[PDB]
Amino acid sequence: DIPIGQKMTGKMTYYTDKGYGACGTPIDASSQDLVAIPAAWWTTPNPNNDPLCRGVSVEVSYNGRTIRVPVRDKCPSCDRTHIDLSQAAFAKLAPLDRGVVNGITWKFVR
């Protein structure tokens, strides 16, 4: 299930896709705050119908700052605690030229 409120340690990368995410909604990761959630959390056989797509966000903390962004996409290559933030969201927490940041904390929220 989706463990709302449970903090996890992991890593964050970012991506820049523009199109439709796995939730079936239009996304522009260069200009919108959102997150792609690792595949291990997805449950429904049709991704547009996943509960991750209905009112679920994440709160991501790094270096004393926390942001809150909606789940809009799936990261098939991400391990369990590796989130792929939009470029726009990632830049609010860390410099884009860092590329990957280990040691973030994140949790699903509603």
Swiss-Prot record:
Main localisation: secreted
Gene Ontology CC terms: extracellular space
Reported temperature dependence: Thermostable. Activity is stable between 20-40 degrees Celsius. Retains about 70% activity after 60 minutes at 100 degrees Celsius.
Induction: By heat stress.
Keywords attached to this entry: Protease inhibitor, Secreted, Serine protease inhibitor, Signal, Thiol protease inhibitor
A GO BP entry: negative regulation of peptidase activity
Compartments it resides in: Secreted
Domain of life assignment: Bacteria
GO MF annotation list: cysteine-type endopeptidase inhibitor activity; serine-type endopeptidase inhibitor activity
Function as written in the Swiss-Prot or TrEMBL entry: Stress protein produced under hyperthermal stress conditions. Serves as a glutamine and lysine donor substrate for transglutaminase. Inhibits the cysteine proteases papain and bromelain as well as the bovine serine protease trypsin. Has hardly any or no effect on subtilisin, bovine chymotrypsin, proteinase K from T.album, transglutaminase-activating metalloproteinase (TAMEP) from S.mobaraensis, dispase from B.polymyxa, thermolysin from B.thermoproteolyticus or collagenase from C.histolyticum.
Subunit and interaction comment: Monomer.
Name of protein: Papain inhibitor
Gene (name only): pi
